[PDB]
Amino acid sequence: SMEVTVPATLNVLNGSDARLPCTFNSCYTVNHKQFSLNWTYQECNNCSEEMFLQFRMKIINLKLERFQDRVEFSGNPSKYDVSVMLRNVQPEDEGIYNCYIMNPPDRHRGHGKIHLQVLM
Amino acid sequence: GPQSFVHFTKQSLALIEQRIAERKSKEPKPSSDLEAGKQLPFIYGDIPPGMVSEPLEDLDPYYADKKTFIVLNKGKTIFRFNATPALYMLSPFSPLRRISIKILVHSLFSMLIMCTILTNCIFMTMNNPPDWTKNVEYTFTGIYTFESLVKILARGFCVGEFTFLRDPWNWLDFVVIVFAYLTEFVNVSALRTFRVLRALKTISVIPGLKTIVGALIQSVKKLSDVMILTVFCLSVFALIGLQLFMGNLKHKCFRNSLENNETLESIMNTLESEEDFRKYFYYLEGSKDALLCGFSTDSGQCPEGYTCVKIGRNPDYGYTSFDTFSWAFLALFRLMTQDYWENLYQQTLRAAGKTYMIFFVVVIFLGSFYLINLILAVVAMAYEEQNQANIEEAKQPYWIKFKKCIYFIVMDPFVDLAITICIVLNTLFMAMEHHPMTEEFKNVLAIGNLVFTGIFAAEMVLKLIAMDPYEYFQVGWNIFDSLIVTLSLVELFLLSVLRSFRLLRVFKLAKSWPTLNMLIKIIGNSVGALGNLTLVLAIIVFIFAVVGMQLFGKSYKECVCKINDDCTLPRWHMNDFFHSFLIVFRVLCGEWIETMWDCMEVAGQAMCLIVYMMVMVIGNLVVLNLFLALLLSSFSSDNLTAIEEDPDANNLQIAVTRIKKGINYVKQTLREFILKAFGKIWWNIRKTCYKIVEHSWFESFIVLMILLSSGALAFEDIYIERKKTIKIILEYADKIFTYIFILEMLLKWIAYGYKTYFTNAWCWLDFLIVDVSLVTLVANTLGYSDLGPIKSLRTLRALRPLRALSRFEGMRVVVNALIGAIPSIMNVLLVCLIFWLIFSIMGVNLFAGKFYECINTTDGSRFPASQVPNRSECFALMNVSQNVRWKNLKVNFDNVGLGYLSLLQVATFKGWTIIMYAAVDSVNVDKQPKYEYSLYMYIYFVVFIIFGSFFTLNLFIGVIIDNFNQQKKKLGGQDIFMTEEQKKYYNAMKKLGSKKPQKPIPRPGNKIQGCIFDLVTNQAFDISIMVLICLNMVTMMVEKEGQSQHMTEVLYWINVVFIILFTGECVLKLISLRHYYFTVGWNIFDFVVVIISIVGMFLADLIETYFVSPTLFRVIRLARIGRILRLVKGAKGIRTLLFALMMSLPALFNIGLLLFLVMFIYAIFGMSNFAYVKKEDGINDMFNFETFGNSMICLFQITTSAGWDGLLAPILNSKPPDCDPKKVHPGSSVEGDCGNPSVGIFYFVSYIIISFLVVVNMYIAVILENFSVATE
Amino acid sequence: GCVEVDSETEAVYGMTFKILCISCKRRSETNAETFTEWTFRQKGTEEFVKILRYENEVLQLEEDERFEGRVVWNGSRGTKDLQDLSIFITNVTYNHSGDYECHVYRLLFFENYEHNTSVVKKIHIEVVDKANRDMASIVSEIMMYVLIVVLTIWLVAEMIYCYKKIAAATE
């Protein structure tokens, strides 16, 4: 698969800002008209994926009810960075975080899995 | 002392230490025969059983004082070590120490290490190792650690003098081990790259490779001056090209009509795609780059609605430009190596104009050929010394009667001749195989092959029963023939390759052929006396291939879409080992620029540049060293053949002798049996006409008429109908010249007589030309002007310039040299044809009828193999759809002649890639090719390049240079390429470079002029001026395309300051050296150079201010190159080679005059023949045979054989739908748009052969002779 | 390939005459759809009246007593890209003397581009009763015999002169 550098497990104290890093490596130059980004969240291994962040020629956020307005971005496609923020993380936010990356002309699709753990 | 073998003991160590203490209290070279690593002299005799592989006392008296002990193995080798305690832990007498030397000296240890290294290389070949290779890597690391640690225990690490670290190969081993241990503990392509350094240990392990590597190092050391001169010439030519063609390759045709208020600047920003650029710039069909244009009349033209503009990127991913000094240097190095140089030639001509071909002519002749020949001369001279030094030191019952009868049958002058004739008949018979066959032809071929193999097996069995098998397997030819017989029987019992193995029996003719034996000597010398050099070459190629794979395979696989529109791997890549090896081999053949472009696109500029330059330099050095080594070991050995010529009375000769004995016995009896059964005025006229013909005025008039007639020939192009007056004038001048030449012929007839006129070859040539002219004139007068071969006879008017051959003495002497070399040239050409016949027959057996394919003719793309697998399907597509063709490859292996053409294309590396792609894609007859289905057919082409290209080129050069040397020595030691008058100038201008002493410019009497004179004569002044010249050169290199306005002014002022300083130096040299400054030629050169510098600066200022002329401004500004040409003064290495070039200049002028005459004749022929062929492949709107200039450009391009396949390709098609035999061609009465395959093939093959014989051979032999002269 | 050869300016009464009009494309590999229009201004007349028009492989002939049945197509055939716009006159008359204009309308086809060009060629026809012989051939043919005679005279003069010198030494 694509070179996607993903931390295995992320633990962040409850009630604090959590930086969730997702990054990749590929040939070519980043094209805004072509970049496709999946941002999925799951409450468990078998839980259904939920889309919260998106990139269709720009940054598009779906404003999920379970996340309210706590989801933010700190990446720019040029530096191969697509990391996302969760301000004021909650115990409900514990689960599985995933970032699929699709950067044409590269036909391979990235896949980076993070299991977020929230401490007391 | 034959009995000097004493065990090393503590008493011996104490005695050595005591002597050292005596020497130290009182305060020569080692014997070569006893030095470590070689064999002990035979004078010592056999080693005692208790002395071998044991610590023994030193034998060299020089080492007797110091503490050194010796160990000798059973292989009779001298190993020297240090008696000091290794690491101050173990003594030489230590128990484990003794075992350490015992296992260190064994040859089994060396065998084990070699096996481990070979297995390591084999595993290095893999690109995706499986999971279980980790254990094998651990085993290799452990074996290497064990091998190194044994050496550490015996000889010590660093403290002594015969220790581990003192050997550089041990340095390499230690670096390998530490870099292998570092990775596993630390725990990417760079890291696995270091693994190739294990393969470099083969040089140390395998005996004899160290000496070869050392000799290669010395050969490199002898190329310092040539390398410096090459760098200087490349830099000067790159500066010239940067001044001339800066930004010219950015010319594009931008559309005139723009919508939505768009502009060039507006549209240039939002364009990142190939299609978007296609929408605004003109592209040719299936082209990756926008079409180049120019602002001149002789440049390329834009389609209606487009205008030329300098914008965008340069062609070939932007890597081809003269924008910066570095890109210009890359372009000039590419020109010097002549790698794809015709593409740059055509691009530059299209962008700048056809008048700029003079730059390419100068670069190719003065720079490319000359520097390469200099490199060859220097390397060959270095190898000659090395070889001289090497040889100089070396010099210092009933069945018994049955087999007796069979032995009587073996009687040679008939049976051996019969077998030779059968071999010749068999190889002729197998050459009749071709793809389109009837069944009866195939059956008769099979029957003939079966009969021939039966005859050969019968002769084998007859010899085996005549002479017993014990000494039957003694002659190499006999075991060879048994091998062929066994292989043929095995093939009969059971691929396509196996059938052609019997072709090797053609080599049996070497016993009588003295040149086939030369070829076999060259071939066997590579794996014999020069086997170590070939092994080093193979190891180097393997290392380069593995390095390329490990460095760029993943980059190729993951960055595919940057170098391929289909996002798939290209034809040439470094993903796996086989393709990386193919790329390395292609680089060794001289083709590196395009694969380097792909590498730089997928993996970065710096890494690919470094790797490709290293591969080029090292591999070219090794290949060329092997080439000269073979050429000198096989050819220069023609000084003494101790054995007599064919001790068996020349077995074939007795066959001829026995036959002519019967012929003489028959001829004498046949004649006998028939006889038994049965005046003053005439000689005055002769003398007067003799006086007329040899008069100088008559000769000058005839020469002028010849030149005028050739110039008139050069006028009949496709545009002759646009100029009616010139056409009429030429038609009447034709009759005038015919009258003049008929009169000249009659005068020479009356003034020489029939005997002398018709015993002269030049007179015969002139007579034949005038007869063809007279027949043409008679046919034109009588009205029989357009029937039968009369147009073809008119076409032969292009041979008229041959009349100038006998009127210029330089061309006459070059033609005489060619004629003298003709016999050996024909002999070696016949040998090379015989050798290439085997390869052509093999290619016919492999690739007959397998190059056909469905193609979608709209884009020329082959249909997949999922749909239309095979031919019936192509016809189905022909009805199912349109623009579908079942198309062959024009040049293929369909028959032996087409195979010869394909092998000529492969040997010259021109058009070979298409043939290789077709061959590796081949599946079967009437089957659609699959991409790299027969991938390992590349091996066929590799073997052919090794044998039919490398070895045949070796034989060609050797024999031709031998013939030239024989011609030179026959005349008494004079150059065979220079006229009698040229020799006097040669002697005088050779003496011009030998006057060592001169009067030392007496100092002026007065004060200030003396006080600046002594400043002039100081060497520090000259060094400072040289440094200033180098700085001016640098300021020239820093220029680039679109730099700035501030940078332009700064550079202009820096150049002005440099000009002022140089003029001041010249003037201050004139204040001193009163009128003595003009004595030295170099001072005259400096004075003239500063004059041109000042004049050019002022003229460029005037042109830029008061005038408008960019091209002429650039040409004028090119004059500042003269300032940096003064760098030659302070260089003895460069001056000597340039003196050799000036030595060779006259012979080069004569050879170039002959070459230009041949080019003129071929240009007239091409204008006559190929002026209307279809514009495809190498012939386009700019490079064709329509006018004289275009034909001259094409012929200059193919003089180096560059792109002759592209020029030949559209002439090969002669039938629909490949052409239109009824094309209209508005403005002319000619119909049809395709050429004659026979005429075109003869034209191009003959021209490339003549160019190879003339330019390459002569340039080398004249450069070689002048280099020898100037190196004394 | 294509060469723009100018038309001959002299026509012979009663004979057949071809008026050349060749307009080659700047680049020969480009695709175009071309049609032509011819206008003729007779001598003594001011306006350039139209005579014919050729488009889509069919020649449309206008009303003209001077060209009612004496004009046939002599240009490119079997194509829409016409680089040869020449016409043929099957019976030359005194009314054919004048100035001809050959209007060429070429429509180039490109990737996303369509360019509409126009080329006008002017041809002057002078009808004569007898075909005059060109002055280029008159001088050239005379220059042949002048050079042939002078060169022969030069050779014979030296040959005769050399005989006197050589024969003198014999005696």
Ligand SMILES: CC(C)CCC[C@@H](C)[C@H]1CC[C@H]2[C@@H]3CC=C4C[C@@H](OC(=O)CCC(=O)O)CC[C@]4(C)[C@H]3CC[C@]12C
């Ligand atoms: C023919 C004889 C003289 C042996 C020639 C051996 C060379 C072909 C080998 C030996 C060591 C090799 C080098 C060993 C290590 C490196 C570092 C390596 O570094 C990287 O890859 C880092 C940068 C990057 O790729 O991101 C690049 C290749 C290079 C220079 C190798 C280039 C090829 C070398 C010079």
Ligand SMILES: CC(C)CCC[C@@H](C)[C@H]1CC[C@H]2[C@@H]3CC=C4C[C@@H](OC(=O)CCC(=O)O)CC[C@]4(C)[C@H]3CC[C@]12C
């Ligand atoms: C291999 C097949 C395709 C047949 C090719 C034609 C052969 C029948 C001809 C071509 C070249 C010929 C050879 C050309 C030259 C020689 C050398 C000649 O001997 C010498 O000239 C000896 C000179 C010396 O001893 O100094 C004996 C015949 C031989 C072998 C000829 C034998 C017949 C050959 C092989």
Ligand SMILES: *[C@@H]1O[C@H](CO)[C@@H](O[C@@H]2O[C@H](CO)[C@@H](O)[C@H](O)[C@H]2NC(C)=O)[C@H](O)[C@H]1NC(C)=O
């Ligand atoms: C030529 O190509 C076809 C492509 O499959 C070969 O196979 C036959 O194709 C036809 C048409 O698609 C099918 O109807 C047949 O059933 C296929 N044959 C078989 C064995 O199933 C065809 O055999 C090829 N012709 C030859 C002579 O090899």
Ligand SMILES: CCCCN1CCCC[C@H]1C(=O)Nc1c(C)cccc1C
């Ligand atoms: C022996 C001096 C020649 C040295 N040197 C010159 C340069 C090319 C290689 C070598 C060379 O020519 N050898 C050579 C010999 C020796 C005889 C006949 C044919 C050839 C090619």
Ligand SMILES: *[C@@H]1O[C@H](CO)[C@@H](O)[C@H](O)[C@H]1NC(C)=O
């Ligand atoms: C996000 O999700 C889709 C799957 O629903 C995936 O194909 C792609 O990576 C993203 N969207 C698109 C259409 O690019």
Ligand SMILES: *[C@@H]1O[C@H](CO)[C@@H](O)[C@H](O)[C@H]1NC(C)=O
């Ligand atoms: C110039 O550009 C504007 C858009 O920026 C456009 O609306 C306007 O019509 C254009 N005018 C011309 C001169 O084409």
